[PDB]
Motif scaffolding. Structure first.
Motif, PDB file in Angstrom:
ATOM      1  N   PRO D 132      37.579  46.038  62.782  1.00  0.00           N
ATOM      2  CA  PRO D 132      38.268  46.994  62.059  1.00  0.00           C
ATOM      3  C   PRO D 132      37.840  48.611  62.421  1.00  0.00           C
ATOM      4  O   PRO D 132      38.661  49.298  62.597  1.00  0.00           O
ATOM      5  CB  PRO D 132      38.056  46.958  60.720  1.00  0.00           C
ATOM      6  N   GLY D 135      39.284  49.144  65.639  1.00  0.00           N
ATOM      7  CA  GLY D 135      40.786  49.517  65.263  1.00  0.00           C
ATOM      8  C   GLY D 135      40.831  51.102  64.848  1.00  0.00           C
ATOM      9  O   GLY D 135      41.762  51.700  65.281  1.00  0.00           O
ATOM     10  N   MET D 136      39.815  51.409  63.825  1.00  0.00           N
ATOM     11  CA  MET D 136      40.005  53.010  63.619  1.00  0.00           C
ATOM     12  C   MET D 136      39.706  53.873  64.475  1.00  0.00           C
ATOM     13  O   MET D 136      40.166  54.916  64.702  1.00  0.00           O
ATOM     14  CB  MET D 136      38.880  52.761  62.324  1.00  0.00           C
ATOM     15  N   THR D 167      44.696  48.982  65.198  1.00  0.00           N
ATOM     16  CA  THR D 167      44.320  48.639  63.955  1.00  0.00           C
ATOM     17  C   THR D 167      44.929  47.331  63.861  1.00  0.00           C
ATOM     18  O   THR D 167      44.325  46.463  63.136  1.00  0.00           O
ATOM     19  CB  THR D 167      44.951  49.792  62.803  1.00  0.00           C
TER      20      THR D 167
ATOM     21  N   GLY F  10      38.532  49.785  55.123  1.00  0.00           N
ATOM     22  CA  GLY F  10      38.560  50.417  56.430  1.00  0.00           C
ATOM     23  C   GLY F  10      39.946  50.152  56.857  1.00  0.00           C
ATOM     24  O   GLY F  10      40.403  51.486  57.302  1.00  0.00           O
ATOM     25  N   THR F  11      40.533  49.155  56.920  1.00  0.00           N
ATOM     26  CA  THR F  11      42.040  49.001  57.686  1.00  0.00           C
ATOM     27  C   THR F  11      42.956  49.692  56.603  1.00  0.00           C
ATOM     28  O   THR F  11      44.211  50.439  57.066  1.00  0.00           O
ATOM     29  CB  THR F  11      42.430  47.638  57.449  1.00  0.00           C
ATOM     30  N   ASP F  14      42.953  53.519  57.705  1.00  0.00           N
ATOM     31  CA  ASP F  14      43.506  53.387  59.125  1.00  0.00           C
ATOM     32  C   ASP F  14      44.907  53.522  58.895  1.00  0.00           C
ATOM     33  O   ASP F  14      45.435  54.239  59.349  1.00  0.00           O
ATOM     34  CB  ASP F  14      43.053  52.078  59.798  1.00  0.00           C
TER      35      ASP F  14
HETATM   36 NA    NA Z   1      40.910  49.425  60.941  1.00  0.00          NA
END
Ligand code: NA
Ligand code: NA
Lengths: 233, 51, 250, 233, 251, 51, 243
Positions: D132, D135-136, D167, F10-11, F14
Motif C-alpha cells: 500500500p 500504491g500511495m 493503489t 493508508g489505502t 489513497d
Molecule cells: Na494505498
C-alpha cells in the motif's frame, strides 16, 4: 461556534441519528442498558462530587484515633462521618470484629470500587472509540448522497450537512465528552484508591491500638508519591 | 498485534475526505465543458486498455 | 434480548433517517454487499476452514438468539441441590430438574462416584473448551471486521477503473462514483456495526459462560464436599460483583 | 479485477513495476536473499501441501507404543513412518540415548520450525505493509503528473491510470495475497507446532514406558486447543 | 554493493524516467519549498531527539555500510585457521608477516602479539564489538526517526500548500498546478520514508547482524590463538558456531 | 504497545486523494454557474439551521 | 544542549520558515483565532487528565532536558572509581572533599557518609530512581496527550470554520480563502503534534532510559563504596553492566 455564527448551525436529526444511534448500538452490543446507566451514574457522581482531600482524611483519621485511645474502641459513634466507606469502617469497628475480617471487607470494597470505575472508563472509552467511526460512516453516506444528487441543490445541502456534521459530532463527542469523561473516571479511580488505602490503614492502626503519632507518619507515606510526583521535587 | 498506522495518516485521510466533500460542492454549482470532457474521457479509455 | 429489540429499532430508524434525502436505491446495491462479503469470506477462509467458520457462525447464533442463564437462578438451583444432598445424599441429585447442560453433566459425573480432583479437572477442561471456542469465534469475526473495509475499498477501486473506462455523459460520473463508493460504505458499516459488534457480543457471552461455569463448578465441588448452603451462599454471591455487573451494582 | 468487465483494463506495466519492484526492494533491504527465498519455499509448502492430521499421528503413536510394549525399542525399526519429525524421534529413541537429550533435540527442532515460520510470516507481512505504501507513492506521482498537465488530455489518462492501478494493485496484493499468505503461514506454524508436540510426547512416553491407552487419552487431550476447538461441537 | 542496493538504484532511475515520461518533464516534481519543508522539518525533529554528533555518526555509518561490503564469515574463518597454522609452526611473532584485510582482526592480532593476557584482550575486543553494535543501533535509530518524521512533515507541507492554493482560489479551474505542488511534499515524505530512510535503517540492522557475527568469530579465533588450540579444533568450533547462528529461513 | 490506525487506512487516504484529485480534474474544465450557486447556498443555510 | 545541535535546530526551523516565506505571504498562515482554538482546546482536554501542577511539572522536566545533557556513563564510572580510590587511600570522610557533579550521586554519597546502613541507603536510592523514572513517564504522558489532542482540536476547528463558511456563502470567490483559514487550525494542530509535542515526548522517553541507566550505575557504585570493594572490581563490574 457562537463566535463563528451560532450553536444553531450544528443541529441535524440525520447526523445525530447516525453518530449517536450507531455509537449507542455498538456500545449496547457489548454493554448492558442497565449497566450503561450505572456507568452514567458513576460518571455523574464523579463530576458532581469532588473526592475527599487526602490530607483532610488523614487528619480526621488521626482525630478518630485520638478519640479511640481516650475512650476505648467504642468512642467514634457520636460525631459526624464524612464518607460512606469510612462510615462502614466505623460501624464494623463498633461491632468488635477482628482485624482480618474488617480488612477483608475493606479490601473487597476497594476492589469493587476500582472495578466499577474501570468499567465506567471502559464504557466511555468504547463510546469515544465508536463515535469517530460513525462520523466517517456519515461522511461516506453524505458523499454517496451528494454524488447521487449533483443536479439537485435541495439534496446537495442536506447531504453535505450530514457528511460534515457527522464528523464534527463524532470528533466533539469523542475528544471533548467521552474521552474526557473516561479520563475523569480514571482520575476519580486513582483518588478513590488513595483514599481507600488511607482509610484502611487508619482503621488497621486504630484496631492495633497504635498511638496516632506513628499513625500520621505512616499515613503520610502515601501522599508523597504516585501521579502527583510531577509536583514533588 | 501489528503496530498500526500513524496518526498523521488519519489526519491526511480526514483532510482528503473533507476536500473531496468540498470539491464535490464546488462541482455542484459548475458546468463541465462537454467538449473538454470527451477528450479526457477518450484519454482515460486509451490508458485503461479499452482503447 | 432487550438490546436486540433496541437493535431492530435502531436499524429501522437509522435506515429511514439515512434514505430520506433521495431514494433507498442510492444506498442499496446487492452487487456491492456481495463483493464485500465474498471478498471478506475468501480472505478469512484462507485462515479459517469451512468447519471453523461455520462453528463461529453457529456460536454467534447461540450467543444472539439464546440468552445465557442468569447467575442468580444458578445460585438458587445450586443451593437447592445442596439442600437435597444434605437431606438425602447424592442419591437425591438425579431426580432433580435441571435446565443447564453443564450443571447436568457435573451432577451426572458426581453421582457415578469420583473424587474432587477428577471432577474438577473434567469441569475445567469443559470450561477451557467453551472459552477457547468463543475466543476463536471472536477471532473469526475480528478477522471479518478487519478485512471488510479493505475489501470494500478494493471493490471501490475496481468500480472506479470501470467508470474511468466507461465515461460518456458528464452527469453520470457522479452516480457512477457514488455506486463505486457504496462498496467502501458497506465495508465500513459491516466492520463497525456488524462484525466487530458480533465479536464483542461473542466475547461478552464468553465472559458470561465462564462465570456461569465457574459458579457451577464451585457449587458442585461444595456439594461433593458436603458444605451447608450458608457458606455456599456467600462464596457464590461474591462472584456476582465482578466484571460489568460489578459496574451495575449501586 | 473482473467486475469491470474483463482483465485488459486492470493491467499496466508501469503500475506493476512501481508496486512490485518497490515492494521487492524494500523487503530485500529488510531481509536477506536467503530469508526471502526460504519464506517463498515455506509459503509454497504451506499452500501446496497439508500438515499431517493429528488423528493419524495419535494412531501411529499408539501403534509404536503397543509395538514397543511387545518388543522393547527394537520393534520400532520394522514399520514405516511417513513423517520426518516422527522418524527422527524414533531414531533418536532407538539409538540408545536418554530422554533428556532427545527431548532437548526435539525441542530445538520444534523451535527451529517455529522460528522459520515466524520469519516467513514476517517477510510476507513486510510485503503486505510496503505494497500500500507503493500504491500511495504511485498515486502521488500520477496525481502530480495529472494535475500538472491538465491542458494536455493525452497525458491526463495514463497518469490517472498509473495512480489508480498502483493503489488497486497495492490493496489487492496486501489484503488478498501477502497478508493472507502470512496468515496461512501462521496457521501452518500452529499446526506444525501442535503436531510436533504430539510427536515429542509420544516419543517421550515410549521412552519412559507407558500404557498405550493413557498415552492415547493424553494425546486426545491436545485435539481441543484452538481452531479445532472452534470446529469441534 | 549488494543486489538490494543495486536493485534500488536501478528502480529509482527507472522511477525518475517513469515520472518524467508520465509528466512530460521532471522540473515539476522538483519544488524548492517542498524540499525545504520536508528536509528542514525532518532535521529539526530528529535533532530534537538526537545530537548533531549522533546525526553525523549515523550518516557516516550508513555511508560505510553502503560503500564497503562486510567480510564473508567463511573467508574470515579461513584466515583465522591459516593464522592458526602460522602461529602453530611459527609462534606468535609469525603473525606480523602476512597481510590482514580486517581491521578488527588486525587489532586483535596486535593485542595478542603485544604480550597482553587473554583477559584484557577479550575485554578490549568485547568493548570494540559493543561500540560497533552501539554505533549501528544509533544509526538505525536516527534513520528510523527520519523515516517516522518525513511523512508527517510531508503532510504538514501539503497542508501549507493547500492553504496557499485555497487562499489564491478564484473560480477554481486553475488550482491544478498548485494542488500538484501541495502534493509534492507528501510525495517527498513518502519516497524518503519508505524508499530511503527505512531501507537505510533496515540495511543498518542487517549490517549490525553481519558485523556482530564477523567480530564474534574473529574474537573467538583470536582467543583460540591466545591459548594455542589446535587449528582443526578451532576450525570445527568456528564452523559450528557459524552454522548454529544461521537464521532458520536460510536452513 | 500503544495502538494505531487500521492497515487499510493508508489505502483509504489513497482512495480519498484519488477521488479528490479526480474532482479537481473535473473542476479544471468546468465553468461556474451563479444561479446554481445561489440555490446551493440557500440549501446550505437551510440544512444548517441558518434559514 | 550542544552548540552544534542547537545550530542544527535553528537551521531546520529557519529552513521551514524560509520555505513558508517563499510560498507567498506569511500572513496567510497566521491566525490568532485558530491558534487559540488549537491551544485552548488542547489545554482543556489535557487538564481533564492532568492537574495544573502536573502540567507545570511536565513542562519543567521537559525544559531541563533541553538545557541539560545526561551525564555520560563513562564519566560516571571514572568518577565513581575515583572516589573509590579516595576512600581506599582515605576513608568515608574523604568523600566529603569531592565536589558536585550529579545531585543524585551527591545525595547518595551524603547519605552514605552520614552513617547509614547499606540496605537503607539502597532503598532510598531505589525510591529516588523510581520517582525520577515515573516523573519522566508522566511528562512523556502529558506531552503525548497534547500531541494526541492537538490534531483532534485542529480538525474540530477546521470543521467548525467550514460549517460557518457554508452557513452563509453569499460569494463564490470567498469560498477558497475561507477554507484556507479553516484549514489553518488543522495546520497548527499538525505542527504542534508532530514538531513540538511528540518530539518532546520521545526525547523525554530517551532521557528516561538514559537517566535510569546512569542512576542504576551510580547506585551500584555507591553500594560498592559502602561495601569497600576493590575499585578495579567495581570498574570491571560496571563496564560489564554497560554491555
Ligand atoms: Na494505498
Ligand atoms: Na462525517
Amino acid at each position: 461556534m457562537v463566535l463563528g455564527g451560532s450553536i444553531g448551525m450544528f443541529v441535524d436529526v440525520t447526523s445525530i441519528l447516525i453518530v449517536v444511534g450507531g455509537s449507542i448500538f455498538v456500545v449496547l452490543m457489548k454493554f448492558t442498558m442497565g449497566q450503561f446507566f450505572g456507568a452514567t451514574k458513576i460518571a455523574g457522581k464523579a463530576f458532581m462530587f469532588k473526592a475527599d482531600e487526602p490530607e483532610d482524611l488523614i487528619a480526621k483519621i488521626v482525630e478518630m484515633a485520638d478519640a479511640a485511645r481516650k475512650g476505648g474502641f467504642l468512642a467514634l459513634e457520636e460525631m459526624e462521618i464524612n464518607n460512606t466507606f469510612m462510615q462502614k469502617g466505623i460501624d464494623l469497628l463498633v461491632d468488635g470484629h477482628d482485624a482480618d475480617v474488617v480488612r477483608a471487607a475493606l479490601k473487597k470494597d476497594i476492589a469493587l470500587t476500582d472495578e466499577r470505575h474501570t468499567q465506567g472508563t471502559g464504557v466511555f472509552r468504547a463510546f469515544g472509540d465508536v463515535a469517530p467511526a460513525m462520523g466517517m460512516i456519515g461522511t461516506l453516506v453524505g458523499l454517496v448522497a451528494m454524488l447521487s444528487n449533483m443536479d439537485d441543490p435541495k439534496a446537495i445541502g442536506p447531504a453535505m450537512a450530514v457528511a460534515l456534521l457527522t464528523t464534527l459530532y463524532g470528533a466533539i463527542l469523542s475528544n471533548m465528552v467521552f474521552f474526557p469523561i473516561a479520563d475523569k473516571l480514571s482520575l476519580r479511580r486513582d483518588q478513590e484508591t488513595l483514599n481507600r488505602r488511607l482509610i484502611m490503614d487508619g482503621v488497621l492502626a486504630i484496631q492495633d491500638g497504635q498511638n496516632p503519632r506513628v499513625i500520621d507518619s505512616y499515613l503520610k507515606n502515601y501522599l508523597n508519591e504516585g501521579k502527583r510526583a510531577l509536583e514533588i521535587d | 498485534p501489528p503496530p498500526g498506522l500513524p496518526l498523521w495518516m488519519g489526519t491526511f485521510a480526514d483532510l482528503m475526505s473533507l476536500l473531496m466533500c468540498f470539491f464535490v460542492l464546488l462541482l455542484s454549482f459548475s458546468e463541465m465543458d462537454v467538449l473538454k470532457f470527451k477528450q479526457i474521457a477518450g484519454s482515460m479509455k486509451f490508458a485503461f486498455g479499452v482503447q
